[PDB]
Each structure stands twice: as structure tokens, then as C-alpha cells.
Mucin-5AC (Homo sapiens), 110 residues
Amino acid sequence: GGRDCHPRCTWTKWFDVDFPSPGPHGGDKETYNNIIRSGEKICRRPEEITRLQCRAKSHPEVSIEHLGQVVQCSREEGLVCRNQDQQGPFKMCLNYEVRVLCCETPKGCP
Ligand SMILES: [Ca+2]
Ligand SMILES: [Cl-]
């Protein structure tokens, strides 16, 4: 047809709505649920979450694996880190942040 129909995609800002506290039930839960309930906007209504990125807030360039940290960065949910999953004897998550790629397909497009 006469239109470029590939999705238009825009990254959100980075969100950091939770901060870890110590103990076996602490962690850092940067889920879309928590982000929205913190007053933050993620995507607009027409757009769909297409990609998630995750990083340590105060160590933004490093692979999280090199910190020995056990985290999940899932497109459906956001980032979850649980203190109980980390190595001891001080079992604790670092502070993470996330950002989202929001994509919207133009009108009348397969
Ligand atoms: Ca956080
Ligand atoms: Cl870094």
C-alpha cells in the first residue's frame, strides 16, 4: 500500500520505583504494576510493550551477571530481584531500574 506500516517505536524514560531493603523477603520489584501505581506513565494506550531493558541504577554499564546477582528481566512483567535468590552471607539485591520500548502500528496495516 501507500503507507510505511512498520511499527513506530519509542523508548520510555528509565523507571526506578522500588528500592531494596535487607532481609529474606526484601528485593527490588520494578514491575509494570508497581511503576503505574507509583504515578508513572509507561506507554500510551495505542502502543504495545515490545522490549524491556534492565540495569543496576548506580552501575548502569555493567552486565548484571558480573555482579553475581540473580534477577529476571521479562518483557511481560518488568524486573524482579529477590533477596532470597542471592548469595550470602548478606543476601541482598542491588537497586535496579528499567525502561520499555513502546511500539504502535500505523492504521490499516497487516
Ligand atoms: Ca529499584
Ligand atoms: Cl557501571
User: Anything to note?
Assistant: The beta strands are 8-11, 27-31, 48-56, 71-74, 78-82, 96-104. Residues 1-110 form one domain. DSSP finds one helix and six strands in the chain.
